[PDB]
Amino acid sequence: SLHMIDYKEIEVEEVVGRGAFVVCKAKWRAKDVAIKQIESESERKAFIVELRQLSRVNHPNIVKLYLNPVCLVMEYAEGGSLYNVLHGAEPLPYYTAAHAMSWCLQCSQGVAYLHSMQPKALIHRDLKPPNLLLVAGGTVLKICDFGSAAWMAPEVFEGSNYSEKCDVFSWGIILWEVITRRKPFDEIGGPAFRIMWAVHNGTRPPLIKNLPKPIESLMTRCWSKDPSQRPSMEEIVKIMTHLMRYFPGADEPLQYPCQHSLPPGEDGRVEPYVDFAEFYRLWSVDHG
Numbered sequence: 001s002l003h004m005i006d007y008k009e010i011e012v013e014e015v016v017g018r019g020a021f022v023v024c025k026a027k028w029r030a031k032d033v034a035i036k037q038i039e040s041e042s043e044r045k046a047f048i049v050e051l052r053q054l055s056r057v058n059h060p061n062i063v064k065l066y067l068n069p070v071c072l073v074m075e076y077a078e079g080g081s082l083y084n085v086l087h088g089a090e091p092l093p094y095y096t097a098a099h100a101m102s103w104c105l106q107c108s109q110g111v112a113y114l115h116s117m118q119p120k121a122l123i124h125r126d127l128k129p130p131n132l133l134l135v136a137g138g139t140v141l142k143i144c145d146f147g148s149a150a151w152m153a154p155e156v157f158e159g160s161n162y163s164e165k166c167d168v169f170s171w172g173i174i175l176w177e178v179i180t181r182r183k184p185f186d187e188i189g190g191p192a193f194r195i196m197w198a199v200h201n202g203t204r205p206p207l208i209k210n211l212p213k214p215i216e217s218l219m220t221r222c223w224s225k226d227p228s229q230r231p232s233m234e235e236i237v238k239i240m241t242h243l244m245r246y247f248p249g250a251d252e253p254l255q256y257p258c259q260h261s262l263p264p265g266e267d268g269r270v271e272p273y274v275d276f277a278e279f280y281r282l283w284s285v286d287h288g
Ligand SMILES: */C=C/C(=O)Oc1ccccc1Nc1nc(Nc2ccc(N3CCN(C)CC3)cc2)ncc1Cl
Pocket: 016, 017, 018, 019, 023, 034, 063, 074, 075, 076, 077, 078, 079, 080, 081, 084, 130, 131, 133, 143, 144, 145, 146
């Protein structure tokens, strides 16, 4: 199930970020790997539940998992997090509508795999760009298990017995986020409960100007208050797969620069960052 490696073979190179446990970069067996060491006795019991599930998981769009001190040797993602690509430190990279749709497609593919596992369906819950990593020039997306109110479905923080349709709600928000390149619910701000109150009362991110109706339809359905009215992840994957015909160029690495300017979208309607001109063009060739 999992390869057993000791700290002697590992070679720690440099620190990365600050998760729940602290993450460090390393090189083991001629492979770059990210390691999440524990520095607490209380946090060791989290490993016991997670290692049973994470060992069984194996998917292209999910992070791969390759003992004293207790650690998890995972594969290193050169591209960083999706949040950093979208809103991070300058210089920000350029990306197109093809990349945005491809990221969401690969994300739905990974979550569908988790939903369909046996015996029980694994729910990710905390699905958000900071946990979506990128590799291969920012073209392949990788999900990683373990202020999230902006991506959290209303029924979750309400305390109701949530289902796996809470991930579908998160995906909907992420779809709005990559198309607009805006932080969802940034204008609200404040503490977390002020966003929860908004989402609970029906507030959603503003509509996007010149957005294709099929994309607008899938996005809003994912936003619906009733979890049963949201589509399954299998449905999202299938729809997103057939839409990519009209979004070529998703394998092109991110290498061109982008200078950050954000116009304030007034009148409850925002401009998209990506451009859909090529989509409407290719859509006309097939349809008429
Ligand atoms: C996958 C769940 C998770 O928590 O991943 C995170 C989140 C935050 C920090 C670290 C990790 N673990 C991790 N990281 C990587 N690669 C990677 C490489 C670079 C970065 N940074 C780029 C520079 N800025 C300044 C900060 C972010 C982040 C992550 N690969 C695999 C894992 Cl498990």
